[PDB]
Amino acid sequence: DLQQLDDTTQLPLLSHFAETVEGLTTIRAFRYEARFQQKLLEYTDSNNI
Amino acid sequence: MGPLAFCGSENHSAAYRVDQGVLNNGCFVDALNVVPHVFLLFITFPILFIGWGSQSSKVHIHHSTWLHFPGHNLRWILTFMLLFVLVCEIAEGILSDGVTESHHLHLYMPAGMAFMAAVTSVVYYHNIETSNFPKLLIALLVYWTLAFITKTIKFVKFLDHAIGFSQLRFCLTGLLVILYGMLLLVEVNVIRVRRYIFFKTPREVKPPEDLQDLGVRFLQPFVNLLSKGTYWWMNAFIKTAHKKPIDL
Amino acid sequence: RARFVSKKGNCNVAHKNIREQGRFLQDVFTTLVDLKWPHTLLIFTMSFLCSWLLFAMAWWLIAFAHGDLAPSEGTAEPCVTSIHSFSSAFLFSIEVQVTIGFGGRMVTEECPLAILILIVQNIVGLMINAIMLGSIFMKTAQAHRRAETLIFSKHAVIALRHGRLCFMLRVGDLRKSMIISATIHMQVVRKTTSPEGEVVPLHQVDIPMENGVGGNSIFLVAPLIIYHVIDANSPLYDLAPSDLHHHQDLEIIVILEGVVETTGITTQARTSYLADEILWGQRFVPIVAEEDGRYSVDYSKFDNTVKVPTPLCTARQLDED
Amino acid sequence: RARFVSKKGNCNVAHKNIREQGRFLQDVFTTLVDLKWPHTLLIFTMSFLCSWLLFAMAWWLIAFAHGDLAPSEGTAEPCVTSIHSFSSAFLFSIEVQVTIGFGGRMVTEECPLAILILIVQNIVGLMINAIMLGSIFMKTAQAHRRAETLIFSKHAVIALRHGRLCFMLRVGDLRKSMIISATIHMQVVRKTTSPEGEVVPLHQVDIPMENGVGGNSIFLVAPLIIYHVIDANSPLYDLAPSDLHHHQDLEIIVILEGVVETTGITTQARTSYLADEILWGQRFVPIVAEEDGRYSVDYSKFDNTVKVPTPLCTARQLDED
Amino acid sequence: RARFVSKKGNCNVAHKNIREQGRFLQDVFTTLVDLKWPHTLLIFTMSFLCSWLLFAMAWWLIAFAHGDLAPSEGTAEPCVTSIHSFSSAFLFSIEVQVTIGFGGRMVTEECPLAILILIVQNIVGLMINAIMLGSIFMKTAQAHRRAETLIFSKHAVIALRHGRLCFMLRVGDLRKSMIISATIHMQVVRKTTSPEGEVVPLHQVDIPMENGVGGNSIFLVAPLIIYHVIDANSPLYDLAPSDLHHHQDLEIIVILEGVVETTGITTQARTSYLADEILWGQRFVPIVAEEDGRYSVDYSKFDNTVKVPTPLCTARQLDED
């Protein structure tokens, strides 16, 4: 249960990296950088626990 | 197994005989040693029984504010050192009683009641440090000073009888009395921090910052040094993972 | 789906997450009385045994410190006569504290600290005797076991009485003795919502008992039908007869309390009636017969109902004829 | 024809066909208190005698199993000194349990199971001592014998007071001490029928006591006239003066209860007034005289009535002038 | 001219000409508690002394019937050891019944009727011990001595409050502990006459206490001013200020009762206010001061009045402006 929980929170962190580095120019189009930074902090706190 | 004598019934009938010095019998310091241990048993068992055994199976103890009185890691480390040397005294009593005859009980029963008193001291300290209330453990203060006064009078009666550092129990009583002096960190726990009783202010240390029901439930870095080491929060989660799934 | 208090009368609450144990040790006496019976007998005999063993260790240390346990008797008198073991001192502490006092072991007047330990053994034995025997008498004399004698109906009913719908139930007393100044507090609990949006999960709102003065006072000799008239001020006013099913948030509790005539101590009996247990349109059979100049009640026919005709809609819609 | 409760105050009910004895053994204490006095003295002395005989059999089996009853004494010490019969062990169990402790028979420290049977004899003797002496004090200290001191009228009367018909009766207190917070619950029982057809055999409906606030609270120093004003809300409203005969279903009970000032325990006094015992048109003689600066009451003239004029029809027909 | 109950709180009644002593012996316990203290100590020590003397005569007759008082000892064992007088048997009955048990005199197992008289001496001694020590504790623990702590005003007053005349008096509590659920029953007694001609000599009619809900419940921490608003339903409505003289038939009694917080037993305090003791037009001084963060009351200035202006006619004539 805990190892399957760690893998299913390990996947959206790399999905968030793969959609940051794809849409980098259109995330620096908006000023939505800090919202995505808070989304990465929520993803890495869930992966860390 | 014999008539179960305290001082042996050695057929001199003379280990019971206090004639020339009133503390110079040598068994009277061993019979004086059991006074704080049966004091701590017969004081600590109704207080622990009325406080924690007498709540029902329906009602439920709180699960946050695990606030430690300071000196906590030092007190658990010296309590495991105390349990180590009391197992050494019980093994010395086994090795010292059976060489002659018929069950000298004073080599067992001080360290047996001291071992039971030390484990009820540490479960009493964990029950007070869980339930936060510092107006008790002056019973622990008079326990550690009564054990310290009886172990110093056993140590100076060993020093009067010219018992040097070749016998084991002289050195083991010396480790016990340097240990019992360093188990008076209750004076560290009352003065310069946590002025609970005999000082004119309370110090009023705040609770830790994740324990105002912040949804944490990780429970490691503020729990006691036994259950830091053996992870006795984690077996509650391993029981909860039986008959449930564990989600995020 | 989940009851507040069962039909036996025990409350189904949990009391989770009490932070303070600091309020619990300020009264040790009511939680000494609140234990179960093997816990009460265990703390009774362990209090008496730990007092006898502690004073046995004190008398054994006195007879060891005088040299009385040593048998080297030249001429000198003992502190205590004929003690030469620990178990003789344990026999002596048993003989002192519950005041048997045989006399093969007795205090001689040599040792003054033996007289001091005898004085404080008699004082602590009288204090432990008073607190423990009064605690076991107040444990066996409490009045919560009187609620097994006081019975209720299996089913409460709703029928017509004097033009109005009345919520009727039957409570009986099974003892020859009486219960003095018996009151009825019928409360209906559910979850409600305010018009300003306040939701409370168990709103213990109170229906009045219809008695004749308005004061809730009864006389429990015959098993009598407690009835509450459904009026517009009552919260059973919009109760529909199709709403008497399972998983319906409606629970009427009946609290009967009074002082028992014999023991003189206040009892309380509580029960519940769920939405499944409330029957519509029925009323109770008259059970009070009469033979040889005495009234007679039949408790075999106690919760028996007869199914009268009743208009099967709400008490609001009965009020417009 | 058959009274609900007599003039002495005992209830005339039968309690037939109780199926469950399962609720009766859950409280042994209130049915231990509920016995008659030879049953109470029989269970008192048989509880003490069966405890002494059971521990006498235990001490006799200890002295038989050690060989102590055999007189072959080489050198060995006994368990108990000087026991050589069963009756010596019965004397020893009497000397232990009510803690006389003579000392010709005493426990020596040889046998440890003698110390175990002495410990459990002292524990069971302290428990039996606390429960039985508290039970005999709560038996002799109950307050249902206080209702013999509190008296009532032989006849209640109906007369005119302030334009209205009032149902008047007189209750006196015959003790120099008082009774604290005395309430009156006058109930009128009969058999009624509903307009929807519900017939109940003893409908304990409640008349209010006219006091002045409306709360039923009195002060029983002088014997005072308790009166209830017959109003249209009262069910004595259609009472005719020709309806005061034998075999008439009308019975007014008067319940007086309060806490006794001396013993501090709650009493209750009950009485009845039948249709033969209710007199019409009479009122009580004033019995409170005055001499040497003190009020004086005469209890010889207590239930004496004087026959005033009264309009001899119903209180409904008095209400239209 | 003659008071109903004095300012100390004792009732001035006589209870003349009670015919029946037959109701008095049915309860011996409440009249055992109702004695004075030398009568209570006399019946205490005479009950214990007559039990010791009766069983002393029984043990002396056993030792006379066995020939044990005769000193002709060939070989045979006694019933009781070392009895050779009546006073030795009186010493033995003292040693048995209050369970001292010395052991120079002890029961040997020869005589079975000695064992029967020992069994019934232990049973009658346990019964007499339970009834007499519970009777002396219920004698010393009764709550009628708590009314000396609860004080009242020397003078009740009548002044104006909120446009209306109010009958005001002051009651204080002089203990640090509290009194739980304290009620006030102010009653005004006089002799009245009915319009139909019924004259009662002490009509205990009840004025309500003005509180704010209407329930008579107070909280006796500070000495607070109990006031009753004179309304047309009150019988102080036609009270004139010239009617406050001696030989005026007007007596207002104040009944305060509640349960004491410490002993847990119900008390009652009563007082009176005559027509001389009721002052017109004055009101009480405010006595509740404040220093160092605590409220402070001065009981030296307790019944001190200040003489305000007040319209000096009746409350009926105040009601038409």
Added chain:
Amino acid sequence: RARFVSKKGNCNVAHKNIREQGRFLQDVFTTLVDLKWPHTLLIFTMSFLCSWLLFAMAWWLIAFAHGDLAPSEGTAEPCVTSIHSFSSAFLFSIEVQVTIGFGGRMVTEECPLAILILIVQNIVGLMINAIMLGSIFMKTAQAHRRAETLIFSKHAVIALRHGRLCFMLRVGDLRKSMIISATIHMQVVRKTTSPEGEVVPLHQVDIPMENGVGGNSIFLVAPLIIYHVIDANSPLYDLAPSDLHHHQDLEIIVILEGVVETTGITTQARTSYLADEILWGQRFVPIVAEEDGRYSVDYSKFDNTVKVPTPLCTARQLDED
């Protein structure tokens, strides 16, 4: 600025300048119970020790007046056996009065005044035993320590309910056992002034508890929200939301009392809510959850408030829409 009674429930009064100590010695028993615990143990062991020392001086004077302390024994029997010191007579008075009775020292039947001093030592020892052990049981069994179990909110709140402003607070019970017939007396104290000029410093005026019948009766199983609806008859009617500050003369006390189910003795719990502690516009979180077929309450979320919208003016100005 200065509280009437604190949040723990102790009253902040002073009781200055009581002139009379004459009322205090008329009841020694309730002020014997009213001490602190080291004063109670000091008067307990000093009463028993002064009785043993006084009768020890009596037995020593008997053995001095007979010449028994002199060892010149020709043939004559003693009064008491083997007394030859004062401390042997102190041992004998200890052996008589708490009824140990060893038998090395015993009363012989020579001296009749020894029998008289033994009789009055047994009578005074039984009286001192009954009064002191009943006093220590009534000291440890009083119900003022039950108020530590009964909790209240830290903050009372004022919010909207059913169109009206309601003064809401939360009281919980932390025991598995119940409390029988629990009443609520909410009182609001301040200093007011009359329109005729009467100023009282702590006017304990009473707000009614909104319950549903009007009788203040609750059922403390779940922690329930006690609310009082602010109406024009209530004196919280002109309460402004800017008046909830420090040094504001407004103090609402909540008195909860009832009889404990276990010990059977009446308790009382009191608290306060100041003007700082009353919050405006907030209401309590619903804390009664439900899992595994039982209701569950969370006492960690007990005094937690949520800040709803509320019109921020007085309840008089809310009443004109």
